[PDB]
């Protein structure tokens, strides 16, 4: 047991001093630094602590060993062997057995003039089984705050760059900048030159050093645990063998139907070898009297109707308009809305992000060749230094932005959230320029010498993409890359277009400007939106032909909605102009009814305005989208009713001396039941479709329903009187379709042989529609709701094409958990001693899957960080001795003592009241260079404490990130699976009830919460609306069940074919497509009703003739009344500007129209001819 030294010598460089050389006998260490020995490696701490050692050597070891402690504190296993190496290497008592000093030089004392000898160089003899057990047991640890390979950092060279021998040589070599003097190691397993290397006991990541420190986790050790689980496969289409298993269930059934159908034509060829009408009669008489009444009292009626219109539409003064998207697309009391309501109250609302996806088209990738050694590393086009300067200039200019509002000048610093303030207040900008801190000088300053550059921006970039949380470059660059705001900048948030682990290959640059969003405050929101407007205008007009910018803003969507919503104003006006043109010329043929067409158009707009005004009075706000889609619908229905009545009158011949009233009463009594049926069926259809939970469709449905009902009523009354006035007029000088239907079409269509083919064809199309039913999309694209000429479309394309990370997730653990106990922490903390099914571990596994579960990254929990901070080893914590105030980590150390005693007892987790005593100081910790990251910048928001009564903890969250989400399927999949993870954790916590529960909050959950129940919502809505139609028909048409059931079956056929057309044109099944289907099922009656009544009330002999008589009579008015009108309406809307209209309203209505026309005018005729109700 000989010495190699005692004492230390003068300064070598920086603060580094070469130890003084002295190989004599040992010396018990002074009672002064008991504290280091215990702490460094107590394996030396017994009795007489005789050691060739000095307390200033212990404290310079302890002091120099800070980073390795930072990257390896997680496994005491590897940390403790590395420590066992330095302490023994430094002042073990048998230093001469395994050490050989080779170089040494004289030292001068400025105190006594005595020349000593510094140890410049020496050879270190290290056992092989020690380096093997150390590197192999800690070698799998990745570095924290990154997916690196913590050895990738503490080795100076990448995972594949160093082995176990080279890494130790590099660590001991001062050529790196850490070793104060170089130690030359020598591989040895057997004693050579009498210099026996070191081979003390070694411990792996699978074993704990002491009975109170749990072993390291299998995240950081590969023998304890493994990738054991794997998602299952999605086997569907169901029963593939078959070709969809629905292509077959339908095709096979159809073949059976075709055989059972043509086999009765075949067997026929072979054989060749006071309630019944009590309610339908009182209506006729009443309408007969009331039409007469309104015709002989025109003045009173029309005047009262105008007074009513005005009295009802003056309530339009209280009209309020909603433009805020949350209110539009989210139910006020949906589960996701309540979750969001809880999150905004305790943690403040999620902030607003202004992205910027920069791209350099005019540049090519260039190559980086490392000077010392290394394979070439190509950098994408956007990572050029010149392009980086131009983008930095753009960013610094975006920071200028002022745009004073309401006699007040606000700035980005003023609104941008600064996490750790007011200490550092610059603010959060998440751009790749933060690695250089937005400094042209920092970006260009180089650390090399002529003929080669040692370090370069790539050198810094490469280092900090590997470790964005370093406080120094540590590759001799000596430049910190934490960011001006203080806090890491994760490379996946500031880049896009790279390849899975090669930020070198980045093709795009992401630049975020997070801005604080405020809860119950309007001046701040006004100021922020006013700032965002100027930001948008600037970015839109910026001229840098070298760059292609795609931008957005939190307020961009709402603004876009109001800009696309006002550009169709011309469209609704033109639609009515063309409708009036058609009505004016077709309504009968100075045999012109222009006056009546104008009267009808004004009555329709009056009905629209009256609905809007009444509901504004009630307090329902306008969506301005409705104000554009509602007029069309109401116009269609109102014009149809007007034509029915006027034409039945025109074709009615006047009896004997009848003046005017008798004729009008007769016409109204025979035509009103049918028009009344259509109008009432539609009103009920609309109102009933107004029961879905979505405020936009709910309010729209109400508005449209009321407008149809009031328009029908007002029409029948004011318009029959005005018809009387115009009929009296023209009686003082002041058909070709019907001919066709009766002469050549009704007979043709009803031939014996054409009828079976037609029925076969329609049932075949119905089978197809039913077959392709389940293959309809779910959800709305989110990029099609914007006009085509909008920059948000380009931004969405750019996202889908470049971005690699998604929306952040917060797993909010509601208020009520304990947190001050070992088990209470095990249910949560993803750590050493905490459970294996803990919240953090479950979120970690989810992030490990990443395709099944879309949660992409690790939890970034706050409690793990808090414990890491409070550990006595770290020494970050330090309280004042007399004041009990937090002594910063950079302090003169006058009298500050460690918070937790550095003992075996102190080593445990702080479970008791110390927990809550020190938690606030941690949350108050700043990013100290000695200590580390500190928490203030990351967890102050995430942890809530209620003052008083023991300061019990509030709701906390563990925020992670989603995977890049590009379509509705992707969003719905993410919501579902986040809810599932939460469900698992809630189960595992085992609450004695539901006092509290985990739930995830992300920004899009409220908009996508409807697609978790849209299928049962659709089923219920369609079924209920159709049952209402059924009942209304079977009641109003008398009580005949056969006609009612036939009509209901035909409209159901119409809906199924509607679903087929949906699938075929790529329309999606969101709450708008669903409202339109429930509406179409109500608009179909206008076709299906006339024919069936003309057939039912008929007294010919046989079924065929009844059908042909009904066809002629009523279908002459039905083809001219409904089809052409609705066609004029839809063709003007076919040129939309919001995409949402042009896709859903236009396609759904065109489909409905042509489908209803064919069905009514062809398939109803034929089906009744075959199986129609006799009489
Ligand atoms: C995404 O990033 C990776 C990591 O930088 C790129 O891989 C490297 O790709 C470059 C491209 O041409 C190669 O040069 C690198 O090395 C080959 O390495 C040998 C020595 O290992 C050299 O002698 C060769 O001259 C060549 O440089 C290669 N290195 C590694 C470790 O993969 C990748 O190219 C990039 N994506 C694309 C599409 O380029
Ligand atoms: C994470 O999620 C993806 C979902 O896309 C999972 O699918 C994998 O990645 C892609 C899917 O596009 C496929 O890998 C294939 O790689 C070959 C290599 O040239 C390429 O030719 C194919 O076009 C395709 O890209 C494949 O569906 C699947 N990969 C494997 C190994 O099964 C996958 O679970 C994860 N993807 C990643 C990034 O590993
Ligand atoms: C290397 O191993 C030796 C022997 O196992 C250790 O010396 C023992 O060390 C313990 C640790 O405190 C002492 O309590 C014993 O008194 C020592 N006895 C003997 C006979 O060695 C030594 O501490 C180990 N060194 C390291 C760095 O682990
Ligand atoms: C952001 O914080 C930095 C330090 O982290 C502050 O100072 C930096 O920016 C100054 C702007 O004038 C520069 O002059 C300084 O050189 C730079 N810091 C250093 C290393 O000197 C600054 O308060 C913040 N940024 C500002 C104010 O622009
Ligand atoms: C290159 C990187 C990985 C090195 C990181 C670990 C650093 C801190 C290691 C490597 C070399 C080590 C130093 C080598 C020489 C001495 C002199 C000795 O009398 C006290 C310990 C001291 C001062 C060591 C302190 C810890 C040390 C500086
Ligand atoms: C047409 C009638 C019924 C009016 C109602 C339509 C409204 C509610 C629809 C039309 C377009 C829809 C938007 C489609 C796209 C987006 C972008 C996404 O980032 C948030 C949801 C949001 C903002 C939707 C909200 C709901 C929405 C605004
Ligand atoms: C820049 C500017 O003129 N701001 C106006 C100021 O002129 C005006 O006197 C004052 C009174 O309302 O309001 C503010
Ligand atoms: C100038 C300076 O000290 N910069 C930091 C510091 O944390 C560290 O001491 C230094 C030496 O490696 O490197 C880095
Ligand atoms: C440790 O044993 C050898 C190297 O010492 C190696 O084959 C093995 O993979 C290591 N164990 C690991 C990596 O878990
Ligand atoms: C814009 O920023 C530059 C740089 O900080 C500054 O000099 C200037 O005063 C700012 N305002 C301008 C140019 O209007
Ligand atoms: C674009 O790149 C050229 C390259 O020389 C540079 O001169 C110019 O300032 C950059 N910005 C422009 C052209 O707006
Ligand atoms: C979890 O609890 C203990 C420790 O791992 C063990 O008995 C059990 O099998 C573990 N199972 C899982 C899935 O972690
Ligand atoms: C460190 O603590 C001292 C004590 O007053 C304080 O002045 C200083 O601002 C602190 N620095 C931090 C928290 O970064
Ligand atoms: C610290 O407090 C203890 C408790 O009384 C006291 O004995 C000791 O002298 C104090 N020393 C310093 C440096 O604060
Ligand atoms: C929830 O946990 C159960 C068992 O703990 C597991 O079978 C299921 O897959 C988990 N759900 C996920 C991972 O979505």
Curated annotation (Swiss-Prot):
Record-linked Gene3D superfamilies: Multidrug efflux transporter AcrB transmembrane domain
Subcellular location: Late endosome membrane; Lysosome membrane
Amino acids binding cholesterol: 19, 57
GO biological process, one term: intracellular cholesterol transport
Keywords, sorted A to Z: Cholesterol metabolism, Disease variant, Disulfide bond, Endosome, Glycoprotein, Host cell receptor for virus entry, Host-virus interaction, Lipid metabolism, Lipid transport, Lysosome, Membrane, Niemann-Pick disease, Receptor, Signal, Steroid metabolism, Sterol metabolism, Transmembrane, Transmembrane helix, Transport
Effect upon mutating residue 912 to W: In NPC1; found in the Nova Scotian clinical variant
Keyword Glycoprotein: yes
Ranges of the Cytoplasmic topological domain: 647-670, 1039-1044, 1092-1114
Disorder named in the UniProt entry: Niemann-Pick disease C1: A lysosomal storage disorder that affects the viscera and the central nervous system. It is due to defective intracellular processing and transport of low-density lipoprotein derived cholesterol. It causes accumulation of cholesterol in lysosomes, with delayed induction of cholesterol homeostatic reactions. Niemann-Pick disease type C1 has a highly variable clinical phenotype. Clinical features include variable hepatosplenomegaly and severe progressive neurological dysfunction such as ataxia, dystonia and dementia.
Domain topic, free-text comment: A cysteine-rich N-terminal domain and a C-terminal domain containing a di-leucine motif necessary for lysosomal targeting are critical for mobilization of cholesterol from lysosomes.
Function in brief: Intracellular cholesterol transporter which acts in concert with NPC2 and plays an important role in the egress of cholesterol from the endosomal/lysosomal compartment. Unesterified cholesterol that has been released from LDLs in the lumen of the late endosomes/lysosomes is transferred by NPC2 to the cholesterol-binding pocket in the N-terminal domain of NPC1. Cholesterol binds to NPC1 with the hydroxyl group buried in the binding pocket. Binds oxysterol with higher affinity than cholesterol.
Protein name from the UniProt record: NPC intracellular cholesterol transporter 1
Lineage: Eukaryota, Metazoa, Chordata, Craniata, Vertebrata
């Amino acid at each position: 047991q000989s010495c190699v030294w005692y004492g230390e010598c003068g300064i070598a460089y920086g603060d580094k001093r070469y130890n003084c050389e002295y190989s004599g006998p040992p010396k018990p260490l002074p009672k002064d630094g008991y504290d280091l020995v215990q702490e460094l490696c107590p394996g030396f701490f017994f009795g007489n602590v005789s050691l060739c050692c000095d307390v200033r050597q212990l404290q310079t070891l302890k002091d120099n060993l800070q980073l390795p402690l930072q990257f390896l504190s997680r496994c005491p296993s590897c940390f403790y062997n590395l420590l066992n190496l330095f302490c023994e290497l430094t002042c073990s008592p048998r230093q001469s057995q395994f050490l050989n000093v080779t170089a040494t030089e004289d030292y001068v004392d400025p105190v006594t003039n005595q020349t000593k000898t510094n140890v410049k160089e020496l050879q270190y003899y290290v056992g092989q089984s020690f380096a093997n057990a150390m590197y192999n047991a800690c070698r799998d640890v990745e570095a924290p705050s990154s997916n690196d390979k913590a050895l990738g950092l503490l080795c100076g060279k990448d995972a594949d760059a160093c082995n176990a021998t080279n890494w130790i040589e590099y660590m001991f070599n001062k050529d790196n900048g850490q070793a104060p003097f170089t130690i030359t190691p020598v591989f040895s397993d057997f004693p050579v030159h009498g210099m026996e290397p070191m081979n003390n006991a070694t411990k792996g990541c699978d074993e704990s050093v002491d009975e109170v420190t749990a072993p390291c986790s299998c995240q950081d050790c590969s023998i304890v645990c493994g990738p054991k689980p794997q998602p299952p496969p999605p086997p569907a289409p169901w029963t593939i063998l078959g070709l969809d298993a629905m292509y077959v269930i339908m095709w096979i059934t159809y073949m059976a139907f075709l055989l059972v159908f043509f086999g009765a034509f075949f067997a026929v060829w072979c054989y060749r070898k006071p309630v019944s009408a009590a309610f339908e009669g009182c209506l006729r008489r009443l309408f007969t009297r009331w039409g007469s009444f309104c015709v002989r009292n025109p003045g009173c009626v029309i005047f009262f109707s105008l007074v009513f219109i005005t009295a009802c539409s003056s309530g339009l003064v209280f009209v309020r308009v909603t433009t805020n998207p949350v209110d539009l697309w989210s139910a006020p009391s949906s589960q996701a809305r309540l979750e969001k309501e809880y999150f905004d109250q305790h943690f403040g609302p999620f902030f607003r992000t202004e992205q910027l996806i920069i791209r350099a088209p005019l540049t090519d990738k260039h190559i980086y060749q490392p000077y010392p050694s290394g394979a070439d590393v190509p950098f994408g086009p956007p990572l050029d230094i010149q392009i980086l300067h131009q983008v930095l200039d753009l960013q610094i200019a975006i920071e200028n932005i002022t745009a004073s509002y309401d006699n007040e000048t606000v700035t980005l610093q003023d609104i941008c959230l600064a996490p750790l303030s007011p200490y550092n207040t610059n603010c959060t900008i998440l751009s790749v320029l933060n690695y250089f801190q937005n400094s042209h000088s920092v970006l260009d300053h180089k650390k090399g010498d002529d003929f080669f550059v040692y370090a370069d921006y790539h050198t810094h970039f490469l280092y900090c993409v590997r470790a964005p949380a370093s406080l120094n470059d540590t590759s001799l660059l000596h430049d910190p890359c934490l960011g001006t705001f203080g806090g890491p900048v994760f490379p996946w948030l500031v880049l896009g277009g790279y390849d899975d682990q090669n930020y070198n290959n980045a093709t795009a640059l992401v630049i975020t400007f997070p801005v604080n969003n405020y809860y119950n405050d309007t001046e701040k929101l006004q100021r922020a939106q006013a700032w965002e407007k100027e930001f948008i205008n600037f970015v839109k007009n910026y001229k840098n032909p070298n760059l292609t910018i795609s931008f957005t803003a939190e307020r961009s969507i709402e603004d876009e909605l109001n800009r696309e919503s006002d550009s169709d104003v011309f469209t609704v006006v033109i639609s009515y102009a063309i409708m009036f043109l058609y009505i004016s010329l077709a309504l009968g043929h100075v045999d012109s009814k222009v006056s009546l067409g104008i009267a009808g158009i004004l009555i329709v707009l009056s009905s629209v305005a009256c609905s809007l005004g009444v509901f504004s009075y009630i307090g329902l706000p306008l969506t301005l989208i409705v104000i554009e889609v509602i007029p069309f619908l109401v116009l269609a229905v109102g014009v149809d009713n007007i034509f029915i009545l006027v034409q039945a009158y025109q074709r009615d011949e006047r009896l004997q001396g009848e003046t005017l009233d008798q004729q009008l009463g007769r016409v109204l009594g025979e035509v009103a039941p049918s028009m009344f049926l259509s109008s009432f069926s539609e009103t009920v259809a609309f109102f009933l479709g107004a029961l879905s939970v979505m405020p936009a469709v709910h309010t729209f449905s109400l508005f449209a329903g009321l407008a149809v009902f009031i328009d029908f009523l007002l029409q029948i009354t004011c318009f029959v009187s005005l018809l009387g006035l115009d009929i009296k007029r023209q009686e003082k000088n002041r058909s070709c379709l019907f001919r066709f239907f009766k002469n050549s079409y009704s007979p043709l269509l009803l031939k014996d042989w054409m009828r079976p083919i037609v029925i076969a064809i329609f049932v075949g199309v119905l089978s197809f529609s039913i077959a392709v039913l389940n293959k309809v999309d779910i959800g709305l694209d989110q990029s099609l709701s914007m006009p085509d000429d909008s920059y948000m479309v380009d931004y969405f394309k750019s996202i889908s094409q470049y971005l690699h990370a998604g929306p952040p997730v917060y797993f909010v653990l509601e208020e009520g958990h304990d947190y001050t106990s070992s088990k209470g922490q095990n249910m949560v903390c993803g750590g050493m001693g905490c459970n294996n099914d803990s919240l953090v571990q479950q979120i970690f596994n989810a992030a490990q899957l990443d395709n099944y579960t879309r949660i992409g990254f690790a939890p970034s929990s706050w409690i793990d960080d808090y414990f890491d901070w409070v550990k006595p080893q770290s020494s970050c914590c330090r309280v004042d001795n007399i004041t009990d105030q937090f002594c910063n980590a950079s302090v003169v150390d006058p009298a500050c003592v460690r918070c937790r005693p550095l003992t075996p007892e102190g080593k445990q987790r702080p479970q008791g009241g110390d927990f809550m005593r020190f938690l606030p100081m941690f949350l108050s910790d700043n990013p100290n260079p000695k200590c580390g990251k500190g928490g203030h910048a990351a967890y102050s928001s995430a942890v809530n404490i209620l003052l008083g009564h023991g300061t019990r903890v509030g709701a906390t969250y563990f925020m992670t990130y989603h995977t890049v989400l590009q379509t509705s399927a992707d969003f719905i999949d993410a919501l579902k699976k986040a809810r599932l993870i939460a469900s698992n954790v809630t189960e595992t916590m085992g609450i004695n009830g539901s006092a509290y529960r985990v739930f995830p909050y992300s920004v899009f959950y409220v908009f996508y919460e409807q697609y978790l129940t849209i299928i049962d919502d659709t089923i219920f809505n369609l079924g209920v609306s159709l049952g209402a139609i059924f009942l209304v028909t079977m009641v109003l048409l008398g009580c005949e069940l056969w006609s009612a059931v036939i009509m209901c079956a035909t409209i159901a056929m119409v809906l199924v074919n509607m679903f087929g057309v949906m699938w075929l044109w790529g329309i999606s099944l969101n709450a708008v497509s669903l409202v339109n289907l429930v509406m179409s099922c109500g608009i179909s009656v206008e076709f299906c009703s006339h024919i069936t009544r003309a057939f039912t009330v008929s007294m010919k002999g046989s079924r065929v003739e009844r059908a042909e008589e009904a066809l002629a009579h009523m279908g002459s008015s039905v083809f001219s009344g409904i089809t052409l009108t609705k066609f004029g309406g839809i063709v003007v809307l076919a040129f939309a500007k919001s995409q949402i209209f042009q896709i859903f309203y236009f396609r759904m209505y065109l489909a409905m129209v042509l489908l209803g026309a064919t069905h009514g005018l062809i398939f109803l005729p034929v089906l009744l001819s075959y199986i129609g109700p006799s009489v």
